[PDB]
Curated annotation (Swiss-Prot), chain A:
Functional description taken from the UniProt entry: PsaD can form complexes with ferredoxin and ferredoxin-oxidoreductase in photosystem I (PS I) reaction center.
Stated name of the protein: Photosystem I reaction center subunit II
One GO cellular component term noted in the UniProt record for this chain: photosystem I reaction center
Record flagged with keyword Metal-binding: no
Disulfide bridges in this chain: none
UniProt subunit comment: The G.violaceus PSI reaction center is composed of one copy each of PsaA,B,C,D,E,F,L,M and Z, and forms trimeric complexes.
Pfam families: PsaD
Segments traversing the membrane: none
Gene3D superfamilies membership: Photosystem I PsaD, reaction center subunit II (3.30.1470.10)
Family: Belongs to the PsaD family.
Keyword presence, Transferase: no
From Swiss-Prot, chain B:
Name recorded for this polypeptide: Photosystem I reaction center subunit III
Record text on subunit structure and interactions: The G.violaceus PSI reaction center is composed of one copy each of PsaA,B,C,D,E,F,L,M and Z, and forms trimeric complexes.
Keyword Lipid biosynthesis applies: no
Keyword annotations: Cell inner membrane, Cell membrane, Membrane, Photosynthesis, Photosystem I, Signal, Transmembrane, Transmembrane helix
Record's function text: Probably participates in efficiency of electron transfer from plastocyanin to P700 (or cytochrome c553 in algae and cyanobacteria). This plastocyanin-docking protein contributes to the specific association of plastocyanin with PSI.
Keyword Nucleus: no
Top-level taxonomic group: Bacteria
Cellular compartments annotated: Cell inner membrane
Portion of the full-length sequence here: 31 to 181 of 181
GO cellular component: photosystem I reaction center; plasma membrane
Residue spans crossing the bilayer: 74-94
A Gene Ontology BP annotation from the UniProt entry: photosynthesis
Family listed: Belongs to the PsaF family.
From Swiss-Prot, chain C:
HAMAP family for this protein: PSI_PsaE (MF_00613)
Source organism of this protein record: Gloeobacter violaceus (strain ATCC 29082 / PCC 7421)
Function of the protein: Stabilizes the interaction between PsaC and the PSI core, assists the docking of the ferredoxin to PSI and interacts with ferredoxin-NADP oxidoreductase.
Protein name: Photosystem I reaction center subunit IV
Location(s), subcellular: Cell inner membrane
Curated annotation (Swiss-Prot), chain D:
Annotated gene: psaC
Keywords of this entry: 4Fe-4S, Cell inner membrane, Cell membrane, Electron transport, Iron, Iron-sulfur, Membrane, Metal-binding, Oxidoreductase, Photosynthesis, Photosystem I, Repeat, Transport
EC number assigned by the record: 1.97.1.12
A single GO BP: photosynthetic electron transport in photosystem I
Pfam family membership, one: Fer4_7
Name of protein: Photosystem I iron-sulfur center
InterPro entries, alphabetized: 4Fe4S_Fe-S-bd, 4Fe4S_Fe_S_CS, PSI_iron-sulfur_center, PSI_PsaC
Binding site for [4Fe-4S] cluster 2: 20, 47, 50, 53
């Protein structure tokens, strides 16, 4: 795929995108149409596969939210790109959207109690253990 | 530092009050003949210093109030105290009466006037109703029906 | 406890603690931890007027 | 990274998952509520701590809790 | 294509909705459950776009609300003429405009507040006296030809009829004949009618009032006729018009000279004088009449530029699409669609212009006084400059607000593709970082000079100061501009202009201390109306302070506009709206990142800006311009009067502004401490209301800091314990008490900060100049 | 804990807020109540020390009748205490009379006004304004020739929400104390510096 038609801006990638991580968002478009860049300004998506390099995951997820709400484009994929060149898919992780429940995911962050039954901070004094355990 | 053994005496004995009293009456007689309509005319200023004559004054000549409960100065604080607590208690009881008879939150933004005048009239005699609700515990909600926060 | 009855809240972190709500729904199923739905006269700080409670967090006053 | 914990009062309404601008959250199947599902926080290394998930949570006192922890480049929201 | 499309009776006129406040918005129509609903009702009541998505219904509400506002202004104007007619000393002031203080508010005698009625306003017809007014209304009414109070009463009645006409048309054009959306989008027809009809014929009809009322009334008062004896219809009799103006109304007839193009007869009552009349300190009325005649011609001409229904004229959309270049992409394309579909885009422009014009009014009125004897009314001059400076500053901030609201609500990427708007957003980091740099440059190199001077003076090193007596910073570009305009009347570039403002004539002087009486314009009361205004080191320094405060205010408001939709911090900020408190404590913390919060912060910097401007105006005019002349020595005695700068100790005489305003301690001691002696000693006399307002405004300002410095989570928890006590005694209300929202707490804080700070200076200024 | 935040102890003494939900929760921590009460402590001790100073300089200056007359209304405090006793202080240096020994207190008095007012910037203009401003400066540094060769080791960010309150309180407090100390010392040492203190005992 190719980049969307955009004349460039000052709101895009900085040296972090060369040395630490940048992000890649991939989507398919059926019609050439104009969308707002998260960097600032207007760009046009091609009639094909679109690839766009962005600075943060939140900028990628904001564009995905715009591509869903305004253009009904669903199949957006977000990759984390490392400076050696490795791409790691980060969104969506298991192919099923996060809002729909899926058999096969592990429950992470579960605390088997209501929030007012957390222990007191005096109970966990002089340890790195927190009261949300 | 200079100790004031006699901070207060009757105003009619203080010569700085006699300064002020003649200085106010002369300004009131100045505006009666060839003058302007003023708040304190000549008869209004006579009555003003008729009241202040049996008051306590400092050395500046201005009346000072005694709020210790002493009964020759009961007009200074004690009699305005009963008049306040009756009128403020009336407005408080009337809002409490109107709140109990409220249809909902719409009665709080659109005042129901014949309900409000009646509660404001019933509030006027509030100690007829309040103290028989104050010894009964009818003035207060029991403790397990009022929300509190964690401890 | 059943639907329609007035109940007091014993959940201490609840906004409606020691207040009286009305049971709107009781989940007839097992496995559900907080099955009783209670509706209240006061909204909380989010404008929400209902919540789910276990039977162990309720006091029937009716 | 912030800690995002989900407590057993979750009714499976998925509103915190939809609210999250970083895709930290997802629904896994559960048996503790009638919906049969509960929010989970597998990707809290992307959590910025915005607490939009807590704003969306309808349960008296909330079933999802964000504890602001150690700050990273991701969690501080830095594009640089 | 320009038609009139109108729906007939779209809204029934009924009082059913008055039983349900908050019907217009879907959250509020569910009734109050918390006290947040009460504040939400007021904040949303005029936000017509939140009430419906129909653009036509929004345009109808705006048009009808505009009639209601015009009716409010006409009621206010009717009240001013009424209080001038019946509650004023206008009759006695007309005989003695330089000896009596104008008063048009008198005070009932209860609680002793009739002390606010003062002598020096007491005269016949106004026996009890009243509050000295500083609005300048008597000078305006006398200038346009009012001589009696019975004429002011007829004007009060006329303004109530115009108000009732305006209020009826608001009912009519909303409830009876409401125009369609395509009627409002006729901007070419609207510009044609407002340029030629409103501005053009408004100025032409005002010229006719000036020619036939204001000129002959002034001719009779200059003849010595008392204003009770002045015939106001004297400009309608051609014979009586003949005696005042022999050439323009002569045997060579008046309208005969017009149609034969013999307009040189009219130079009796239409001139090009320029300067001020030496007796009144004001502009010539024949200049004012020729001004309004010339700008009526140009405005009526300007109102034929745009094409409506007869082929000829310009199309604005085709004009905007043609003005593009390589450096600017598609140029002005799409801006026609912006400006004819966004009410906020039009309001942002029109507030930017109205605020900037009001500031131009402030500068031009002190320097080119249009009203006789007003230049010696120093409290009026101070008040009118300060009032219009504040109005202009508030409107410019509103321009920044509604530009931001446009960016959140009405911006569309499809309309703005590589046009001017799209390309500004694509280098917003370049714009704001350069604006960040220039504010830091200006702040270091202007305020740091004051701090340098404070420190050098305290260290005993006055030769190391930036001052006229020390290292000078002459404003040589402004002095050059003054030299050009001093030479220009009679000179080469304006040969038949007879004069200009006296402020320019600073050629020819190196300080205001060495000013003689021949150079100044003093009236018969020996008070200086206006003078040459010397610009030295202190004026260099304070003008770069002005540039600092304006650029920071621009920086805050433009950052709010350019980052209203997104930032590197919050990429989908536009989905949160124009007005949101934050996006939570994450990303380090995002408090006040909304575009609304930039308006909030920009109001303080506007406050800081206008406060320096009016403080500069007050001290500079008192030290360098205003004062008295002596008929011996030709000596100019300014209001303050000539500090001696030690320096050696061979003393150096400068004006007090030039000697003392160059450091902050001079502003604290010689301006704020010295001139507050009027307001803090005002008790027991008629300026005692200003002393009360001075203290009360300090209180309100301090009270604002409770809101600005705290957060609502404290107050909500405090309300919890108080609601407990009301719950415990069956006095809890159904509308649950909530702390103010985060945004409202900011809005309450800035409103009380602005109210307290501005009213302090108001009390300070008016007690200073009405006492001396 | 409270009704707005029942699990507040799990978050500690000092934390910014719990976000804009539940109506908004700025300044909900116990630390923030410390921060609010420092203003009220400074105000209270200000009232205490104003009262001590004016009553004693009226004693030292033989002006007790002026204190007894003018301390009963707030203009008397503004005029007869603040305005009158500022005169030797703000005349500590001047273009007309040079400098004297009070010039350091005059300079500190202005310094204290400046520091106190600088505190208002931190107390009023909160973090998200400054963070977006810093990101443009970060852009400017990385794009500027000869300067982009120099790189920070730690990424510039705006001060935290709690830090903005603490730094704003610190400037407010330091400016409060330095202003009053400059006023208290210079007004006393110039207008009322010395007195007898011997007395005749009473019987
Ligand atoms: C500070 C506490 C205090 C309190 C609660 C009171 C309360 C009272 N005093 Mg006061 N009193 C006080 C201090 C106090 N006093 C002091 C320090 C003095 C000396 C100046 C006085 C000198 C004083 C006099 C001379 C009288 C009172 C009286 C009263 C009673 C007012 C009658 C009434 O109820 O209406 C009331 C019980 C009156 C009384 O009749 O007491 C029974 C009364 O005649 N008091
Ligand atoms: C029905 C009216 C009513 C009544 C009986 C009370 C009673 C009380 N208030 Mg409450 N209060 C009220 C209205 C009322 N309040 C309102 C409208 C507000 C918002 C301004 C408050 C804010 C408030 C605070 C912050 C505090 C109290 C406290 C208290 C308690 C001590 C007395 C006091 O401090 O008053 C002070 C009263 C005010 C500050 C508000 C007075 C404003 C007006 C006069 C009341 C409105 C009258 C109402 C419109 C009348 C309608 C009647 C008509 C329809 C017939 C007492 C239980 C204190 C407490 O908790 O002590 C334990 C306390 O700290 N009140
Ligand atoms: C719109 C601006 C405006 C303002 C600020 C005022 C203000 C005032 N008017 Mg004016 N007035 C106005 C317009 C205004 N008026 C208009 C449009 C008319 C009809 C032409 C009048 C006709 C008028 C008369 C006849 C009188 C006043 C009086 C007053 C003064 C006392 C207020 C009062 O009596 O209220 C009463 C209190 C309430 C209504 C509380 C509610 C006050 C300074 C009185 C005055 O000046 O006394 C010497 C007076 O007698 N006004
Ligand atoms: C003659 C009586 C009259 C009646 C019965 C109505 C009735 C209605 N109007 Mg209409 N309207 C009228 C006159 C009237 N109007 C006039 C004179 C104007 C020109 C200003 C309008 C312009 C107008 C607009 C733009 C809108 C309405 C709307 C409405 C509907 C709801 C209004 C509401 O509930 O808010 C309650 C409002 C009040 C009780 C009054 C608020 C007054 C504020 C606080 C001050 C306003 C100043 C005033 C306009 C000028 C006074 C000048 C001077 C003489 C003092 C309701 C059918 C709304 C609608 O139909 O939406 C679909 C709507 O959007 N009206
Ligand atoms: C020569 C004819 C003429 C004149 C004298 C005016 C005068 C005015 N119009 Mg305009 N208007 C006109 C033709 C005219 N209009 C035409 C032909 C259109 C349709 C294209 C408009 C569409 C229009 C709108 C939408 C508005 C005005 C408004 C106004 C008022 C501006 C506020 C002010 O300065 O006072 C002013 C009374 C404003 C107003 O205040 O309405 C009450 C307003 O909102 N006019
Ligand atoms: C719309 C504004 C306006 C209106 C209503 C008038 C109205 C009038 N003009 Mg005026 N006039 C005006 C603007 C206006 N003028 C302007 C802009 C100029 C400068 C060119 C003049 C210069 C002027 C002259 C020289 C004369 C009039 C005269 C008149 C009167 C006509 C007498 C007649 O013969 O029948 C009439 C009252 C005539 C008159 O009789 O004056 C008393 C007359 O001789 N006017
Ligand atoms: C022609 C001028 C004009 C017009 C038509 C508008 C119109 C609007 N503005 Mg804009 N604006 C303007 C000028 C204007 N503004 C100016 C000069 C400023 C700078 C202050 C702003 C800054 C601004 C902001 C920051 C916002 C708006 C908003 C709005 C919209 C809703 C207004 C509302 O319902 O609030 C309701 C009005 C009130 C509740 C009354 C306001 C009372 C003020 C704050 C205090 C008054 C005190 C007074 C000065 C002194 C009284 C003291 C005495 C009583 C003791 C409406 C589109 C809001 C919006 O969201 O747009 C979509 C919004 O957030 N405006
Ligand atoms: C007296 C108190 C005070 C001071 C000194 C400042 C200073 C500043 N503000 Mg702040 N501000 C204040 C009150 C103050 N503000 C308040 C009360 C608010 C709440 C509304 C704000 C809200 C605010 C906003 C929203 C913004 C500012 C900005 C600025 C900077 C403006 C650019 C500049 O002038 O650089 C020169 C620096 C100075 C004048 C500061 C002192 C340096 C002097 C010359 C002495 C030098 C000493 C030397 C270095 C010692 C070694 C400057 C650092 C703006 C900014 O950051 O733009 C770059 C900006 O956007 N402020
Ligand atoms: C000042 C410079 C100047 O006036 O240039 C004016 C220049 C005009 O460029 P164009 O010839 O593209 O102008 C066509 C105009 O109709 C604007 O669209 O505009 C720019 O280059 C963009 C502004 C950058 C300016 C940044 C500063
Ligand atoms: C300690 C050390 C190693 C120093 C080395 C040597 C160095 C570089 C000295 C430089 C120190 C300075 C001056 C750093 C700039 C501080 C800054 C980011 C201020 C912007 C800011 C303002 C104005 C607020 O009002 C505010 C309110 C609430 C929350 C956040 C903020 C906020 O962020
Ligand atoms: C006609 C008329 C006037 C009737 C009287 C009307 C009746 C019945 C009640 C009157 C209630 C009114 C008018 C005001 C109380 C507002 C309030 C909860 C203030 C506390 C508060 C303070 C002090 C802050 O600093 C602050 C800072 C930042 C965010 C939030 C807050 C905050 O919430």
């Amino acid at each position: 795929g190719s980049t969307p038609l955009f004349g460039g801006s000052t709101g895009g990638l900085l040296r972090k995108a060369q040395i630490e991580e940048k992000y890649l968002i991939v989507w398919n478009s059926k019609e050439e149409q104009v969308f707002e860049m998260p960097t600032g300004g207007a760009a046009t998506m091609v009639a094909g596969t679109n690839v766009l390099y962005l600075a943060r995951k939140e900028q990628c997820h904001a564009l995905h939210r715009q591509l869903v709400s305004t253009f009904k484009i669903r199949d957006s994929k977000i990759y984390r790109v490392y400076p050696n060149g490795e791409q790691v898919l980060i969104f969506p992780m298991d192919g099923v959207p996060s809002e729909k429940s899926n058999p096969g995911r592990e429950v992470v962050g579960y605390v088997p109690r209501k929030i007012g039954d957390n222990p007191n901070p005096v109970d966990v004094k002089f340890t790195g253990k927190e009261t949300f355990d | 530092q200079t100790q004031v053994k006699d901070p207060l005496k009757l105003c009619k004995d203080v010569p700085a009050y006699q300064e002020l009293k003649t200085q106010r009456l002369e300004a009131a007689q100045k505006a009666q003949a060839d003058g302007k309509p003023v708040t304190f005319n000549e008869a209004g200023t006579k009555q003003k210093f008729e009241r202040y004559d049996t008051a306590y004054c400092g050395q500046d000549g201005y009346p000072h109030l005694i709020t210790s409960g002493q009964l020759d100065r009961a007009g200074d604080f004690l009699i305005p105290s009963v008049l306040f607590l009756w009128i403020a208690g009336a407005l408080g009881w009337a809002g409490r009466l109107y709140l109990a008879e409220s249809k909902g939150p719409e009665d709080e933004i659109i005042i129901d006037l014949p309900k409000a005048i009646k509660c404001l009239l019933l509030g006027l005699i509030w100690p007829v109703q309040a103290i028989p609700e104050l010894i009964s515990g009818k003035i207060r909600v029991p403790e397990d029906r009022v929300t509190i926060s964690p401890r | 406890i059943e639907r329609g009855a007035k109940v007091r809240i014993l959940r201490k972190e609840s906004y409606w603690y020691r207040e009286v709500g009305t049971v709107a729904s009781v989940d007839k199923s097992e496995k559900t931890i907080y099955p009783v739905t209670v509706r209240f006269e006061k909204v909380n700080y989010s404008g929400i007027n209902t919540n789910n409670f276990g039977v162990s967090e309720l006091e029937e006053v009716e | 990274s912030h800690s995002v914990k989900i407590y057993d009062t979750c009714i499976g309404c998925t509103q915190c998952v939809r609210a999250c601008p970083l895709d930290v959250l997802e629904m896994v199947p559960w048996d503790g509520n009638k919906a049969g599902t509960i929010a989970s926080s597998p990707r809290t290394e992307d959590c910025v701590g915005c607490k939009r998930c807590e704003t969306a949570c309808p349960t008296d006192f909330l079933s999802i809790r964000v504890y602001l922890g150690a700050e990273t480049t991701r969690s501080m929201g830095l594009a640089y | 294509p320009v038609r009139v499309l109108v729906d007939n009776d779209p809204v029934p006129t009924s009082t059913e909705k008055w039983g349900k406040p908050g019907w217009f918005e879907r959250n509020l129509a569910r009734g109050p459950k918390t006290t947040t609903w009460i504040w939400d009702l007021h904040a949303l009541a005029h936000d017509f776009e939140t009430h419906t998505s129909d653009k036509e219904e929004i345009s109808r509400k705006i048009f009808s609300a505009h009639f209601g506002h015009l009716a409010v202004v006409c009621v206010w104007l009717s009240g001013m003429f009424w209080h001038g007619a019946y509650f004023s000393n206008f009759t006695a002031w007309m005989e003695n405009p330089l000896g009596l203080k104008p008063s048009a508010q008198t005070v009932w005698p209860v609680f002793g507040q009739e002390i606010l009625n003062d002598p020096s306003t007491v005269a016949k017809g106004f026996e009890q006296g009243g509050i000295v007014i500083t609005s300048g209304l008597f000078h305006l009414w006398r200038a346009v030809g009012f001589t009696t109070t019975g004429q002011l009463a007829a004007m009060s009645i006329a303004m109530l009829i115009i108000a009732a006409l305006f209020l009826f048309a608001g009912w009519f054009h909303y409830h009876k004949r409401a125009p369609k959306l395509e009627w409002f989008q006729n901007v070419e027809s609207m510009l044609n009618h407002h340029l030629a009809g409103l501005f053009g014929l408004g100025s032409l009809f005002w010229t006719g009032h000036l020619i036939h009322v204001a000129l002959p009334v002034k001719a009779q008062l200059d003849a010595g006729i008392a204003p009770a004896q002045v015939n106001p219809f004297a400009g309608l009799d051609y014979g009586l018009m003949g005696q005042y103006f022999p050439k323009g109304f002569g045997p060579n007839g008046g309208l005969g000279a017009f149609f034969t193009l013999n307009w040189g007869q009219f130079t009796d009552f239409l001139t090009f004088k320029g300067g001020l009349e030496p007796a009144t300190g004001a502009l010539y009325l024949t200049d004012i009449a020729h001004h309004h005649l010339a700008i009526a011609t140009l405005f009526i001409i300007a109102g034929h530029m745009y094409r409506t229904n007869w082929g000829i004229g310009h199309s604005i959309k085709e004009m905007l699409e043609a003005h593009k270049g390589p450096l600017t992409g598609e140029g002005h394309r799409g801006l026609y669609e912006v400006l004819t579909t966004s009410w906020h885009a039009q309001l942002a422009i029109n507030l930017a212009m109205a605020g900037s014009i009001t500031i131009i009014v402030a500068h031009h009125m002190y320097a080119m006084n249009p009203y006789p004897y007003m230049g010696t009314d120093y409290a009026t001059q101070i008040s009118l400059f300060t009032h219009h400076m504040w109005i202009g500053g508030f409107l410019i901030v509103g321009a920044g607000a509604h530009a931001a609201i446009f960016m959140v609500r009405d911006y569309d990427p499809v309309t703005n593709q590589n046009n001017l708007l799209d390309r500004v957003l694509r280098h917003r980091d370049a714009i704001i970082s350069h604006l960040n740099w220039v504010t830091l440059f200006l702040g270091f190199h202007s305020f740091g000079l004051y701090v340098h001077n404070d420190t050098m003076q305290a260290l005993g090193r006055p030769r190391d100061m930036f001052a006229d007596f020390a290292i000078p910073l002459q404003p040589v570009f402004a002095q050059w501009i003054q030299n050009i305009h001093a030479a220009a009347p009679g000179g080469a570039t304006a040969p038949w202009v007879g004069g200009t403002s006296p402020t320019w004539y600073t050629g020819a002087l190196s300080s205001a201390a060495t000013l003689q009486a021949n150079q100044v314009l003093a009236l018969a009361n020996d008070k200086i109306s206006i003078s040459p205004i010397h610009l030295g080191t202190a004026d260099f320094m304070v003008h770069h302070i002005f540039a600092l405060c304006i650029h920071v205010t621009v920086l805050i408001l433009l950052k709010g506009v350019l980052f209203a939709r997104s930032s590197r911090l919050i990429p989908d900020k536009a989905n949160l709206g124009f007005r949101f408190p934050c996006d939570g404590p994450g990303r380090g913390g995002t408090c006040q990142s909304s575009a609304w919060d930039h308006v909030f912060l920009g109001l303080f910097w506007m406050y800081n800006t206008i406060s320096v401007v009016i403080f500069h105006f007050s001290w500079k005019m008192q030290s360098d311009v205003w004062g008295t002349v002596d008929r011996s020595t030709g000596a100019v005695n300014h209001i303050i009067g000539n500090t001696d700068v030690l320096l050696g100790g061979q003393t150096v005489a400068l004006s007090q502004y030039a000697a003392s305003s160059i450091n902050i301690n001079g502003w604290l001691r010689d301006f704020l401490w010295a001139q507050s002696s009027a307001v803090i000693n005002s008790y027991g006399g008629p300026l005692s209301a200003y002393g009360l307002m001075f203290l009360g405004a300090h209180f309100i300002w301090a009270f604002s800091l409770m809101f600005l410095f705290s957060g609502r989570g404290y107050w909500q928890e405090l309300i919890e314990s108080i609601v407990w006590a009301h719950n415990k005694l069956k006095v809890a209300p159904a509308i649950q008490p909530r702390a103010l929202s985060i945004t409202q707490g900011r809005a309450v804080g800035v409103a009380h900060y602005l109210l307290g700070g501005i009213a302090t200076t108001w009390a300070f200024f008016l007690a200073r100049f009405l006492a001396l | 804990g409270s009704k707005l935040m029942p699990d507040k102890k799990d978050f500690g003494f000092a934390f910014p807020c719990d976000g804009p939900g539940r109506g908004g929760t700025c300044d909900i921590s116990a630390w923030d109540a410390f921060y609010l009460a420092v203003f009220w402590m400074l105000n209270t001790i200000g009232w205490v020390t104003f009262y001590w100073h004016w009553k004693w300089i009226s004693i030292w200056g033989d002006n007790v009748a002026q204190f007894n007359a003018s301390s009963t209304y707030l203009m008397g405090w503004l005029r007869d205490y603040l305005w009158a006793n500022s005169a030797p202080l703000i005349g500590g240096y001047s273009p007309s009379g040079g400098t004297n020994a009070l010039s350091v207190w005059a300079w500190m008095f202005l310094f204290g006004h400046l520091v106190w007012a600088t505190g208002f910037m931190f107390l009023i203009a909160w973090r998200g304004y400054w963070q977006e401003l810093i990101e443009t400066l970060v852009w400017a540094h990385e794009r500027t020739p000869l300067a982009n060769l120099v790189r920070w080791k730690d990424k510039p960010v705006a001060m935290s929400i709690v830090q903005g309150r603490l730094v704003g309180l610190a400037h407010f407090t330091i400016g409060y104390i330095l202003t009053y100390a400059a006023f208290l010392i210079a007004s006393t040492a110039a207008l009322y510096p010395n007195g007898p203190a011997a007395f005749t005992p009473a019987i």
